[PDB]
Design a protein around this ligand. Sequence first.
Ligand code: PO3
Length: 496
Amino acid sequence: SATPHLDAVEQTLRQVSPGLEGDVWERTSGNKLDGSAADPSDWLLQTPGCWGDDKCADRVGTKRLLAKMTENIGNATRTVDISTLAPFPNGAFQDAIVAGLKESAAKGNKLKVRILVGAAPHMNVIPSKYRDELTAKLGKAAENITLNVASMTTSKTAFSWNHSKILVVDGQSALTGGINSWKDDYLDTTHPVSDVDLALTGPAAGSAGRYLDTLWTWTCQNKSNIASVWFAASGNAGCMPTMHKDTNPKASPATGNVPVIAVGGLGVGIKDVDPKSTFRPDLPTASDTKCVVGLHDNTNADRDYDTVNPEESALRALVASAKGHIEISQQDLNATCPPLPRYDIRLYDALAAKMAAGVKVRIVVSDPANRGYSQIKSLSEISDTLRNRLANITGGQQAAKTAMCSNLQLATFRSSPNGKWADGHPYAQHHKLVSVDSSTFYIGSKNLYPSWLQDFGYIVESPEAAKQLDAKLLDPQWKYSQETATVDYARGICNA
Ligand SMILES: *[PH-](=O)([O-])[O-]
């Protein structure tokens, strides 16, 4: 096969979540990574993109991200479909959205627009305030636009709400990844968060539209339930649960030859199980993930949860598909317990199995000196766990340590020679990135640390794009980050 990695992931998803195929996950052909003619790797919307400079003077990444938001929206003829994590877009992110909408409206187009945020759960005025602010900023363009704005919470007790970050235009183009539209963390700061989105076009953008219809179908159904949904619309417009299906082709036009698996999850409180699923997982055991006995562990101990959250299985299957090497860049691999379990056992088992077979694993996480942008005190909380899982399959602890130190790179993130930004603040990293075999990679919103949220992303099998990702992001990341490594097989470092 030309697509061995996607083939394996696809087979897993059809066993885990067959009833969600089309809507919460979908394999498509005919896509394109949407880079420019001058810089074809600039589909890779990293921010800030100021490698080597502790003052981050020339933020080529940020500039491209904001320009690409405006460009895609300004090309809209029918729909603009946005999700993110609250707060609603502000600063230059909002400026970019407004500029795009005005550009489309002046080109004569009449648009339907949805903007959905997830938030922690009386009289939430935020959606209505954002609607009215956007309408004022649009000026005459507002006459051409039907707007829906909502904040939603699907489960208070499971801490479940939207955390996908998607921008889809006409079902044709999509931007997605880790980037929240938060000016203070990403833009107006001398210690910007490092993160990444991708830009694509093709049928896979339609998959994102169908995912958003799934979320908006729930949101609209629950719009009268305060505490679940706060909704606001322009004029006398109603809630649009199926804007994508209603307005855009069932299969978007083809734009290239790139195969993609779109995959998300429904978190907790939308749908409890895929009734079509006959998935029968072999669930591992551990004694050090559920920190307290009363916690219901959806990540490790709930078969039904898996069936409505195919993204967890997809990421584990992506790791399991690697023949040569795996690079992982995350805010965290481990979560804060309670209320989440500390780690995904199946994930750590999949990484252990790869290392036991001589496949190289690199994990770069955010510096613990950031502890919202870190959830561990020490890299040992990752390496100890990998070693203990390795012990189960290598026959003991000494053989585990040797396997780990022979096949692992483990470090915290830097983007310049300095241990911190020049302003003295630690580097914060927020990617949700997995790349394997310089072939197939995930960019999206789904963290590898336990999390029970609505998330979304793309798994792309394209060696050319993976090589661009190496050159523009993974290679410079390791150039600077390697100085913090506690384990590095390539230099014989084993301080763990
Ligand atoms: P996310 O914005 O919580 O990872």
